[PDB]
Amino acid sequence: QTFSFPFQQPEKCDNNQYFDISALSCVPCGANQRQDARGTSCVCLPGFQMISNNGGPAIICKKCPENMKGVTEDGWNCISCPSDLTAEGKCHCPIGHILVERDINGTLLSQATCELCDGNENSFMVVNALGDRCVRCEPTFVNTSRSCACSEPNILTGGLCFSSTGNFPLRRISAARYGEVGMSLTSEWFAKYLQSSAAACWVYANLTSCQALGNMCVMNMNSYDFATFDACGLFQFIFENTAGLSTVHSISFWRQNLPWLFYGDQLGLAPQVLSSTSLPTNFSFKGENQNTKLKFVAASYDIRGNFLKWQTLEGGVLQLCPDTETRLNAAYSFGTTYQQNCEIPISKILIDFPTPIFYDVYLEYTDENQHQYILAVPVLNLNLQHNKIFVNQDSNSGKWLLTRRIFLVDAVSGRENDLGTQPRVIRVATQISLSVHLVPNTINGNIYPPLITIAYSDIDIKDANSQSVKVSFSVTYEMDHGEAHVQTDIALGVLGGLAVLASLLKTAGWKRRIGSPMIDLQTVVKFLVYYAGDLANVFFIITVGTGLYWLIFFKAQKSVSVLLPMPIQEERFVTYVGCAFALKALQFLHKLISQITIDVFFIDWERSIWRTYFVANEWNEIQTVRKINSLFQVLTVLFFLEVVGFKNLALMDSSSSLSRNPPSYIAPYSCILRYAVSAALWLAIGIIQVVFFAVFYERFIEDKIRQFVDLCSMSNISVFLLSHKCFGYYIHGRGQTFEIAISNQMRQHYDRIHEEQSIKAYHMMNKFLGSFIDHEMDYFIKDKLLLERILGMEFMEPMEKSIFYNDEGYSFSSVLYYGNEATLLIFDLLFFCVVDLACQNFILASFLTYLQQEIFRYIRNTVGQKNLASKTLV
Amino acid sequence: QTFSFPFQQPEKCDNNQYFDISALSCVPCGANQRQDARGTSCVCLPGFQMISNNGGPAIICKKCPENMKGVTEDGWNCISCPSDLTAEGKCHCPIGHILVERDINGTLLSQATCELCDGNENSFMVVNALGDRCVRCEPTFVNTSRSCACSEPNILTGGLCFSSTGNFPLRRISAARYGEVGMSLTSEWFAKYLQSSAAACWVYANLTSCQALGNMCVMNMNSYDFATFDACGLFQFIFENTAGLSTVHSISFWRQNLPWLFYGDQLGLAPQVLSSTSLPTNFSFKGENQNTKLKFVAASYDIRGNFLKWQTLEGGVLQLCPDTETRLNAAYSFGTTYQQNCEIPISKILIDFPTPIFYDVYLEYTDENQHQYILAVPVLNLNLQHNKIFVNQDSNSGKWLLTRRIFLVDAVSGRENDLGTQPRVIRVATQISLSVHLVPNTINGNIYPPLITIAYSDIDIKDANSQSVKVSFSVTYEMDHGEAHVQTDIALGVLGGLAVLASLLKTAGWKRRIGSPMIDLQTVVKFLVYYAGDLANVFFIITVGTGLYWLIFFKAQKSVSVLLPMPIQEERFVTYVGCAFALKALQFLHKLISQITIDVFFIDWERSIWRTYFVANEWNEIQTVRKINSLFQVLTVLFFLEVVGFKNLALMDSSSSLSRNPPSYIAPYSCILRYAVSAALWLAIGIIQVVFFAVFYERFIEDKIRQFVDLCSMSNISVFLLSHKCFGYYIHGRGQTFEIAISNQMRQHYDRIHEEQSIKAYHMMNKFLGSFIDHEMDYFIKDKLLLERILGMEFMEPMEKSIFYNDEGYSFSSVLYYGNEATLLIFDLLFFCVVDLACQNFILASFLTYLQQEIFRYIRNTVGQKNLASKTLV
């Protein structure tokens, strides 16, 4: 069959119907019965006394005789009444009396007399809100008054009765709660329980009221106007007037009875508090030291000041975002920079935080003589009016007031005229932050006291079924960069000074390789280009060294002495690196432009057109072999980082693990280690490729360069190059490769040929270079020295001979994109580490370094060969 | 200064010391005072009457005169005693009396007489556990007995007093709770509250006890032994004996008072319940239908059967893993296949689940006439003994018992001898699953009733500070694959039948291209190879079509009619696809082997050695240009999938969005859509590359093939190929390219030359092919037809002429890795979609399709050119 029946709710059963628990449908009560208070059964009508009622819904009651109209408090019986009946027919009598119907024995009386409670003699008694038995009246009443009357000469506020003659806060209190920006609302909680709690804290020593006034100075945002008179003004008044009983432990800010709320009513105690050592613990990371976790505790008081309990902050206290127990607990381990972010809806907050609970966070350590101690943690409130000016949101850490107490959700102090209706404003703590800061020069883990910088939002409530709240939480670690900046400045400076000597030598070499000894204007521009090139390397070295220093001394250290930089330091380092990319790009573009506009020429018979199109095409295919298999390199670098797990060395955590198991917490990435692993895998695989590639292909797979040298020998062609204006390359005449330097007289001759025009002129020069090399120019051969070969220069200037230099190391390889693969290897690394830096994605970083290779690989092969068509035949 | 003081706990203050709330240190009580019950103040010693005590800790009490040794219940006064003193000095008297010290007024009496409560007459009264006032005795006592004595002739169990004569479960109950595998322990809860609840449910109608016995049949695992007599045997006994008052709504399994626990005491009601329509709702996904969420409700009863409330399952009920409001609320969302997994520790469970709460899940819909209804959900318990055999963990859905009630944590029924000490076994529900199954043939969203398959673990507790529990939760959707399997079988079958005609034509062509008309054994192997090749394509087409059909008809549909397959269907599809990869790999290897072992020859002068090394090297560089820029393609395919967001089309969810914002829930991937986007981007970018690449390079960047045809014209070389044994390629003699078919007589001549050996023989054949083409062989030219050009065959057999075929479409391109890039394009796609299928990672999928290209690219260029050295000079 089918199993379905109408949906019925207990709230919708009729007044004469009751809700069944095993049938889930409304059921009529029966005979003169009516629905009970809650609706799961029926209790019958006034005037009817109940006979029998077991644990079932069906009950039997009968109209008892009319001469006894009323019933007892319990509906088992009915008896006569001394006065008129009630609406429920329960035989009341006037305000101040107790309704006696039973006896001492419990037997009935059938008359129901009601007698006055004494309350005015050696034994004090007042009715107990149910009208049954006398109960004792409040001890305050019986003290200040004489027997719980509290007439006009005394004062009755908040439920107590203080004598008029004694001390009493006589002043027109202001029960105003400071709102978001320019609002305020006279909350009922203050206006009812503020004056009473002040006077009870002062006159008697009734501590829970002193705490209940500390909590009113905290729910209102610690705002000490110092000219008006509200919760915190009242707290400071009580503080000032209770100076006879001085201080509690040794803290001048802590009065004997009151709690500890402020750090002082003045605005200079921020550094002297935040910068005092006072913590003997020695935190570490892994080894023989077993202190990796911060031991927090927190004493939690109710609204009325009741001291619930002590408790460790572990397990998710004062972090109101939900997660498993591992992540929450791990947001407290020394080293793991926690960061959490969720989005609560209003209805859940109003259900799970009916009233505020106030905490005072403490940090627990051990003393010298093995006794245990606790330290105090100072909270920067960021919402703290002081003279209607927000002090705690500044930059100068001198104008800071440090409070002591925090809460999470405050759905009480926002209530309007009636204390039981509903808030119109609820106040949530939407940004908590705990910052740990270790003393400057250490060998151990000593730290300053931590700090909690809480900031409270004042969300409105107009739907209570929408307007989710955006709450967060953070724990961030720090240190004082003293040696880092100075040693980087020094190193950088001296490398820059060392780099000036390299650009001068290169510029003077480029000077001596052109027939013009005058530094008119081209020299200065050439020197600036060379200097950009030779300073990009210094910036690159500094950045890789610094990133790798951070990685090595942070991931593997026994007793903590360095902590990674935060955003500011990251930014400084980032600024230091964009410069390296810009300057290296400048050098690469200059080199490519210098390579494209070359002058080349083939001589037919040195040592027809269907032979030169053979060599010319082979040369046009050898101009972009990079000695490093590019694509493979990029893919390998993107592999290690993403699937074997090296990108997990970059987490801001304390463990240099690999492939963190996903019940763990995954700390945020640091953009100063992301540039260390990326730029240490790239160099580690670049070096591999040289040794592997080079050696392997030299032993056995093709070496295209050494083929082209021999290919000319099997087709008796000669290749003639001119690099700048007077420095060239080989001839294949004695084939051997070897550099040539051309005398100024010859370059004059070579340019006078540059005005049927192909064959007519092409053959004029083919009979000239064959007449130049086959012996009034008369070149001569020579050899470089061991000092010239590192200087990249020339000592002897050609002016009458046009000297030739023998070089067996394939010198002509520095123009065809092969012998200058250092720049390419590096320039393809800063591109990867800059796209990785703007958008932190790794696939996007290495799809944009492959895309920039092929564009520049294509530009070289198109404009390069288009040039060669003009400089030679067709 | 420093702010630190010793750490002190209230539990450690001495018996004469009290804990301060504002000083947080132990403080001595004072004069004859002692620590209070809780420790936040002091109440003074016995024999001392308290004078004054306000809300402070300091109190004053004095030793009152010795003639009145005892004090009242309240320590404000002291009075005489009628008997001896107590340990606390509160002047007790014997067991059955009330201690009267006040009066009706509340005045003192100074004698403290104590009087008997009546309890035995027309007004019944018994002391009230504080010894102060008479209060009424239990209604059961006053019913069955006559005035709450309950002597021997009646029975006093669990707190009630049932008459002996009436009905009563007279049988030796067994209070044994079934454990994990072979354990059991006599829990105290059953042995105290089982017989009493049974007898109260039967004799009176006291409903909360009937529920309290349903809960005992549920905490014990519904195990109906049917020969012993324990909680569920007792429930079935009460069910059988209460047949006078029949059934509640219409359900024959639901007795009038008892709850609904079972679906029947027999083992065939599983299909008839799980397969009845009974749900008029029409679920959809996006459009004008506004039913996307399943409307669950659940009535929750306490242990004692109290009916807490109705509530929707949203917000995280019966899923005890912590998460943000959004994931928990998104669990019930028609389409999103939820899957959750966390790991609770014991201490948290024992803190947050002090006692069980029992739910009964219902699904709510709307009737025809706008009234609202609820359906019933059946839970498969999987731990349900039936005759000491586990029925619900089978495969046959006929031997299934379907229960009704579930709970989450049961830390009560495991307790040993004393009910208040501590559990030794706690029972957690560690695997919940909700499975939704839509009726076979629909146009709307009608479904079967859902099902909850809960399975309870019985974790032990030996540390309570370790042994975390591994709990989960799942919601999975399903449908009946009726047309899918038959239509795939049919389609596949007819494509296979169509594919037999292609392998026969190819085999007959390969037959006619060799001079051997006999099918000895090579024909059958060749045909099998061709058939593997031509059937891999059919499998590939079926798989892509099916995956893309699922994607199109599931992501974009208005009123739901298809749901994605689960693991079983996934597996079937996976089995269907590994075949395509294996067969395509076989075809690719065969093609590569056939291409390597080719016969090639260059003729010097047709239309010296420094001219042929020019053409030979150009040909050796044109053999691996693929018409599709491989690397780029792979990278582009790995880009779209990971950074622009196409891998989010593969989520098993209901939205075809892109880049899902991460406050959302991220549903699991389906390995049957992951093969649809991957193999629809690859084809979409492969087609782009052809049109783009081809056209662009034809208009303007090099076309290497058309260069080699002309390069021969500028060096008067001729290229001579032999594909199989008698079918070859061009000559460059009239340069034009055109296929050649060699007569059997000539191939006999060409092989007799194959026995100074280079030049001696090399020139013998160079003077022969020049003597063959320059006119007793006498080739002749002809032309193919429009029918031959699609058949890839020949109609006319060469036996006396060795015919030549003119073909202007560069026919010689089918051996050098260019004109057969279809296989390469596809074979590189199934490699990507198979490595993606074993390990679901995407970077690893496309680092292993780039790595397999270069290995096969290298094998071709090494063994290919090593072959050419033997077949030609040097």
Domain boundaries, chain B: 186-241, 257-480, 704-811
Task: Write phi, then psi, for A394 (nearest 5 degrees).
Answer: -130, -170
- Closest CB to A57 among B10, B22, B207: B207
Q: In terms of CA atoms, which chain B residue is nearest residue A851? A: B632
Whole-number Cα distances in Å, A170 to A167, A194, A234, B751: 9, 13, 11, 128
Contacts of A211 in chain B (CB under 8 A): 21-22
CA distance B778 to B773: 8
The token pair at A348 is: 């859940």
- Which residues precede a break in chain B, with C-to-N distance above 2.5 Å? 607, 734, 755, 775
Which of A413, A383, A385, A380 lies closest to A397, judged by CA?
A380
* Quoted resolution (Å): 3.3
* B596 contacts B867 by C-beta, under 8 angstroms: yes
- Closest CB to A107 among B55, B107, B123: B123
Q: In terms of CA atoms, which chain B residue is nearest residue A2? A: B278
The token pair at A260 is: 């500890």
* B722 contacts B707 by C-beta, under 8 angstroms: no
CA distance A534 to A684: 22
- Closest CB to B139 among A9, A54, A139: A54
CA distance A740 to A743: 10
CA distance B426 to B417: 15
* B27 contacts A205 by C-beta, under 8 angstroms: no
In angstroms, the separation between the Cα of residue A590 and the nearest Cα of chain B is: 26
CA distance B162 to B200: 8
Task: Indicate yes or no: CB of B5 within 8 angstroms of CB of A631.
Answer: no
CA distance A154 to A143: 12
Selected for mutation to probe chain B from A25, A49, A54 (highest B CB count within 10 Å) is A54
CA distance B792 to B803: 16
- Closest CB to B639 among A200, A278, A843: A843
Which of B326, B292, B325 lies closest to B664, judged by CA?
B326
Task: Indicate yes or no: CB of B133 within 8 angstroms of CB of A133.
Answer: yes
Q: Obtained via which technique?
A: cryo-EM
Which of B733, B747, B806, B755 lies closest to B777, judged by CA?
B747
Contacts of B617 in chain A (CB under 8 A): 618
Residue A87 DSSP SS3: coil
* A391 contacts A268 by C-beta, under 8 angstroms: no
Residue in the structure block whose two tokens are 């020019």 = B614
Largest CA distance in chain B: 156
The token pair at B834 is: 């198979």
Task: Indicate yes or no: CB of A23 within 8 angstroms of CB of B322.
Answer: no
- Closest CB to A105 among B118, B843, B844: B118
Task: Indicate yes or no: CB of B125 within 8 angstroms of CB of A136.
Answer: no
In angstroms, the separation between the Cα of residue B863 and the nearest Cα of chain A is: 12
CA atoms within a 13 Å half-sphere pointing along the CA-CB vector of B178: 25
Task: Indicate yes or no: CB of B322 within 8 angstroms of CB of A321.
Answer: no
Task: Write phi, then psi, for A431 (nearest 5 degrees).
Answer: -155, 105
Rounded to 10 deg, the angle between the A630-639 and A821-838 helix axes is 40
Whole-number Cα distances in Å, A567 to A430, A669, B443: 22, 11, 57
- Closest CB to B843 among A98, A638, A714: A638
Handedness of CA B613, B728, B788, B537 (dihedral sign): negative
CA distance B718 to B603: 5
Residue B232 DSSP SS3: helix
Contacts of B375 in chain A (CB under 8 A): 3-4
- Closest CB to A117 among B76, B105, B621: B105
Task: Indicate yes or no: CB of B123 within 8 angstroms of CB of A104.
Answer: no
CA distance A570 to A478: 12
* B445 contacts B559 by C-beta, under 8 angstroms: yes
Contacts of B121 in chain A (CB under 8 A): 107
CA distance A666 to A327: 9
Task: Indicate yes or no: CB of A325 within 8 angstroms of CB of B310.
Answer: no
Task: Indicate yes or no: CB of B125 within 8 angstroms of CB of A139.
Answer: no
In angstroms, the separation between the Cα of residue A640 and the nearest Cα of chain B is: 10
Contacts of A106 in chain B (CB under 8 A): 117-119, 123-125, 134
Whole-number Cα distances in Å, A24 to B236, B239, B254, B366: 22, 19, 12, 17
Residue in the structure block whose two tokens are 């989710």 = A468
CA distance A198 to A242: 12
Residue A68 DSSP SS3: coil
In B166-304 the beta strands, taken as DSSP E runs, fall at: 177-178, 184-185, 296-301
- Closest CB to B118 among A106, A613, A850: A106
CA distance A735 to B532: 54
Contacts of A314 in chain B (CB under 8 A): none
∠A424-A425-A430 over CA atoms, to 5°?
A: 155
Selected for mutation to probe chain A from B8, B20, B54 (highest A CB count within 10 Å) is B54
- Closest CB to B5 among A74, A256, A373: A373
C-alpha distance across the termini of chain A, in Å: 94
The token pair at A681 is: 């895998």
Contacts across the A-B interface (CB distance below 8 Å): 300
CA distance B316 to B325: 8
Task: Indicate yes or no: CB of A22 within 8 angstroms of CB of B56.
Answer: no
The token pair at A453 is: 């910088």
Handedness of CA A269, A271, A272, A278 (dihedral sign): positive
The token pair at B666 is: 């991220």
Residue in the structure block whose two tokens are 């009034």 = A776
Rounded to 10 deg, the angle between the B522-555 and B567-596 helix axes is 140
- Which residues precede a break in chain A, with C-to-N distance above 2.5 Å? 607, 734, 755, 775
Query: Which string of b and e fits B318-344 if b means at least 16 CB within 10 Å?
Result: bbbbbbbbebbbbbbbbbbbbbbebeb
The token pair at A595 is: 């390579």
Contacts of A248 in chain B (CB under 8 A): 22-23
* A325 contacts B345 by C-beta, under 8 angstroms: yes
Which of A84, A46, A405, A41 lies closest to A258, judged by CA?
A405
Q: Please list the alpha-helical segments (H only) found in B598-673.
A: 609-621, 630-639
Task: Indicate yes or no: CB of B375 within 8 angstroms of CB of A52.
Answer: no
Task: Indicate yes or no: CB of B324 within 8 angstroms of CB of A307.
Answer: no
Selected for mutation to probe chain B from A104, A235, A246, A278 (highest B CB count within 10 Å) is A104
Selected for mutation to probe chain A from B7, B281, B844 (highest A CB count within 10 Å) is B7
Task: Indicate yes or no: CB of A57 within 8 angstroms of CB of B204.
Answer: no
Per-residue DSSP letters for A788-842?
A: HHHHT--SSPPSSS--EEE-TTTGGGGTTTSTTHHHHHHHHHHHHHHHHHHS--S
Query: Which string of b and e fits A2-36 if b means at least 16 CB within 10 Å?
Result: ebbbebbebeebeeebbbbbbbbebeebbeebbbb
Q: Give the type of residue at A779.
A: Y
In angstroms, the separation between the Cα of residue B284 and the nearest Cα of chain A is: 23
CA distance A724 to A759: 26
CA distance A263 to A224: 13
Query: Residue A602 belongs to what H/E stretch?
Result: strand A599-603
Count CB neighbours of A149 within 10 A: 13
Residues with Cβ within 8 Å of residue B781, at least 6 apart in sequence: B734, B738, B803, B804, B806
> What's the length of chain B?
874
In B525-647 the beta strands, taken as DSSP E runs, fall at: 599-603
Contacts of B42 in chain A (CB under 8 A): none
Residues with Cβ within 8 Å of residue B625, at least 6 apart in sequence: B704, B705, B817, B818
Count CB neighbours of B218 within 10 A: 25
CA distance B245 to B259: 14
Task: Indicate yes or no: CB of A115 within 8 angstroms of CB of B107.
Answer: no
Residue B157 DSSP SS3: strand
Query: Helices H, strands E: what count in chain A?
Result: 21, 32
Cross-strand pairs, A59: none
CA distance B696 to B694: 6
Task: Indicate yes or no: CB of A310 within 8 angstroms of CB of B635.
Answer: no
CA distance A583 to A531: 9
Residues with Cβ within 8 Å of residue B863, at least 6 apart in sequence: B596
CA distance B563 to B566: 9
Residues with Cβ within 8 Å of residue B592, at least 6 apart in sequence: B856, B859, B860
Residue in the structure block whose two tokens are 């990371």 = A285
Whole-number Cα distances in Å, B427 to A698, B390, B460, B745: 71, 18, 8, 90
Q: Give the burial class of B157: count Cβ atoms within 10 A of its Cβ; 0-12 exposed, 13-18 middle, 19 or more buried.
A: middle
Task: Indicate yes or no: CB of B117 within 8 angstroms of CB of A105.
Answer: yes
CA distance B209 to B216: 10
- Closest CB to B638 among A305, A632, A843: A843
> Cα–chain-centroid distance for residue B793?
53
Selected for mutation to probe chain B from A5, A22, A325 (highest B CB count within 10 Å) is A22
Task: Write phi, then psi, for A477 (nearest 5 degrees).
Answer: -110, 155
Contacts of B324 in chain A (CB under 8 A): 321-322, 342-343
Residues with Cβ within 8 Å of residue B792, at least 6 apart in sequence: B505, B506, B509
In angstroms, the separation between the Cα of residue B515 and the nearest Cα of chain A is: 39
CA distance A54 to A63: 19
Task: Indicate yes or no: CB of A22 within 8 angstroms of CB of B122.
Answer: no
- Closest CB to A374 among B5, B273, B305: B5
Beta strand A160-162 with A155-157: parallel, antiparallel or unpaired?
antiparallel
* B77 contacts B71 by C-beta, under 8 angstroms: yes
Cross-strand pairs, B358: B301
CA distance A409 to A432: 13
